């Protein structure tokens, strides 16, 4: 409780205030995003073969018994698909072919050669168009106590769907038959650089080829280039098409009208608000000379950029430069067209991840971070401005009760006096509850509670495996155990 004189104290003077941060410069643009192509190349082929079946029948006294049924597929030759099947819708009743290094000849019904009409097969639900010649199997007539042979030749034409995967050196048919030739092989137009596993006399091309439909009989109007390959089981025909305009190893995934591009040091950051994704690329562009069989990219990007620009950015924006290409992390190729508003005109294979969730977690983290740092940056500016503004009131309250102001500022109960700054040295009944009024402004902030995220899947890996009807591993394990369950593979005689 003393006077004052020696020790003197001054108030801190207004502090420099944090400045509103610079802000991010986004380039607006149009983007199309490409992913790895997983779907095979699909094309239409026609199979041309003959079911040849010979039966051996023993004739008892009251019964007859098959002693053997030999079944074989025989290819129709090139001259018969051109001069009989396509010309007249007909097929010769004789199969002449090479099976086991021998020319075998089979006559239908063991009768002389006849041209037999191809007629539509019986209707099945999810099948394609097929045509055949005979409905019945020929068996020999009964004469007693003999073995007799009987031959059936059924000429079958069916239109099948064909599938090929990268590097497009083979293709499959819907029957399950591998063809070890590229779909794009040929003798014309530089197509001989492709892969074939067959001898050259098995493959022919026909220009000016006119399909005659086996049902309607109408010859086609536009000619085609017809490939024809004679495999040892069948002849397949398909229309030739060049490889590069018909194959792309990269598939269009998303078209986005509003793609913002930002600078992230050594990298670009490409964000979408519609997809709620953001991708990270390098600043240097990806060259389209690096993508193997990638001719679809620049064509499908340019077709989608100008369609979006004429529906969204026609009179409000202008393009800047040509389309730019960037390889994002996770295996996404982003084609990007930069834009600018009308008020401001002064080889390898890309492998794409199955999960895009890193880009959606990157969007949602950045969209919260930018809001929280903006709002808390304003509270930091407004707090420094308010504390520098209350010094005016502290300089006037100091001259009224110096004892109370120096005790609130120094830290301990201090008696005070001034000369230009504070000189300061250290220092009934009852009625505890009088009516009270608050000079305080309340502020009730609560905490964000702890949340727990459980594992959640819509379909598990076990549910996706048994979604199909037939498991090939499970059917081959059951069928190869047939001898071990019903026979004796050990005992002789």
């Amino acid at each position, epitope marked *: 409780p003393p006077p004052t004189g020696a020790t003197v104290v001054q108030f801190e003077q207004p502090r420099p205030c944090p400045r509103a941060p610079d802000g991010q410069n986004y380039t607006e643009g149009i983007a199309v995003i490409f992913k790895e192509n997983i779907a095979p190349y699909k094309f239409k082929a026609t199979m041309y073969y003959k079911d040849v079946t010979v039966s051996q029948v023993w004739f008892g006294h009251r019964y007859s018994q098959f002693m053997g049924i030999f079944e074989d597929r025989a290819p129709v030759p*090139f001259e018969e698909v051109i001069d009989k099947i396509n010309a007249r819708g007909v097929c010769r009743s004789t199969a002449k072919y090479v099976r086991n290094n021998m020319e075998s000849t089979a006559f239908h019904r063991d009768d002389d050669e006849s041209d037999m009409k191809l007629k539509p097969a019986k209707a099945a639900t999810r099948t394609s168009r097929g045509w055949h010649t005979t409905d019945l199997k020929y068996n020999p007539s009964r004469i007693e106590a003999f073995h007799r042979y009987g031959t059936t030749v059924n000429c079958i034409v069916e239109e099948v769907e064909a599938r090929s995967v990268y590097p497009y050196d083979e293709f499959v048919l819907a029957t399950g038959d591998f063809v070890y030739m590229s779909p794009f092989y040929g003798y014309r137009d530089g197509a001989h650089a492709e892969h074939t596993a067959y001898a050259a*006399d098995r*493959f*022919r*091309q*026909v220009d000016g080829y006119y399909e005659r439909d086996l049902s309607t009989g109408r010859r086609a109007s536009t000619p085609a280039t017809r490939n024809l390959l004679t495999t040892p089981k069948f002849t397949v025909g398909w229309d030739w098409a060049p490889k590069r305009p018909s194959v792309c190893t990269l598939t269009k995934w998303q078209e986005v009208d509003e793609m913002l591009r930002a600078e992230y040091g050594p990298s670009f950051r490409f964000s979408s608000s519609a997809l709620s994704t953001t991708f990270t690329t390098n600043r240097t562009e990806y060259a389209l000379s690096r993508v193997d069989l990638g001719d679809c990219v620049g064509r499908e990007a340019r077709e989608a950029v100008d369609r979006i620009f004429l529906r969204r950015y026609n009179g409000t924006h202008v393009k800047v430069g040509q389309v730019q290409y960037y390889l994002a992390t996770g295996g996404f190729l982003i084609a990007y067209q930069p834009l600018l508003s009308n008020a401001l005109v002064e080889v390898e294979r890309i492998k794409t991840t199955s999960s895009v969730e890193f880009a959606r977690l990157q969007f949602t983290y950045d969209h919260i971070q930018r809001h929280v740092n903006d709002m808390l940056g304003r509270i930091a500016i407004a707090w420094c401005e308010l504390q520098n503004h209350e010094l005016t009131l502290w300089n006037e309250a100091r001259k009224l009760n110096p004892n109370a102001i120096a005790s609130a500022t120094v830290g301990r109960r201090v008696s005070a006096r001034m000369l230009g700054d504070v000189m300061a040295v250290s220092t009934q009944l009852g009625r505890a509850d009088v009516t009270t009024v608050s000079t305080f402004i309340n502020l009730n902030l609560t905490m964000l509670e702890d949340h727990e995220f459980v594992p959640l899947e819509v379909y598990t890996r076990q549910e996706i495996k048994d979604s199909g009807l037939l498991d090939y591993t499970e059917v081959q394990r059951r069928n190869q155990l047939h001898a071990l369950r019903f026979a004796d593979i050990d005992t002789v005689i």
Partner: antibody
Amino acid sequence: EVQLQQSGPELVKPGASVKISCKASGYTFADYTMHWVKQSHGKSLEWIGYINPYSLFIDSNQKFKNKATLTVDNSSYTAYMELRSLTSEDSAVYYCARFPPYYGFDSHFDYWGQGTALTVSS
Amino acid sequence: QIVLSQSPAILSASPGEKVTMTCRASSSVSYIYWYQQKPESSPKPWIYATSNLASGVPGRFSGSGSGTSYSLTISRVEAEDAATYYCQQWSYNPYTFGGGTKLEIRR
């Protein structure tokens, strides 16, 4: 034996039109294409085009898209070639040649006509 | 428009020795063909499918090659071999022939 009998010599004025015939015998005419080649004096062989007598499909050289048109008389088994707007550079020997109606390793010009000497002068 | 550059344009050969021709193509062709022509006569098929001999040509003739490089060899040249030999392609439109090699014999 396979024989391709061709028209013969023909002198022709400039601007006129001429029609060369190639007659076939010894083989079935409908399942072989019929080609035409040009050989100028002291020069090499230039291809013109062909025609399939069965399908009337015509593939041709685009250097001769205004000069040559091709047609087939199915009854007489003869192939024709009509040269239009004859200038001086059309003076050459023209041959007709047999070729398969497909493309394989075998598909070559196995039989040739004797030629026709065509002179555009006055 | 496949040019078929063919060398040498003239080839002298004493009867009995082996000689060779060349046919270079501007791009790769599936097969090269060969045709001989004697003066005031039609061309004749000589070698098809780059190696297969035609109907009635002697066994002293042989061909080889693939892609853009092709050759025509004679094992022991005779006096009846003096002709003009054309290489030919049909892989692109239009069909094109070569300029021609001419065998002279040195008696």
